[PDB]
Amino acid sequence: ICLXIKXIXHXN
Ligand SMILES: CC(C)=CCC/C(C)=C/COP(=O)(O)OP(=O)(O)O
Ligand code: NA
Ligand SMILES: [Zn+2]
Numbered sequence: 001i002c003l004x005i006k007x008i009x010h011x012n
Contacts, residue, residue: 004012 001009003009006012
């Protein structure tokens with residue numbers, strides 16, 4: 001969603 005943290009979420 002826009003937090004830019006690698007390792008959690010879709011992959012951004
Ligand atoms: C207790 C939990 C599950 C906390 C999750 C917080 C977090 C760093 C999410 C990543 O968001 P992101 O914007 O990097 O996600 P995406 O890769 O989908 O964009
Ligand atoms: Na992420
Ligand atoms: Zn995100």
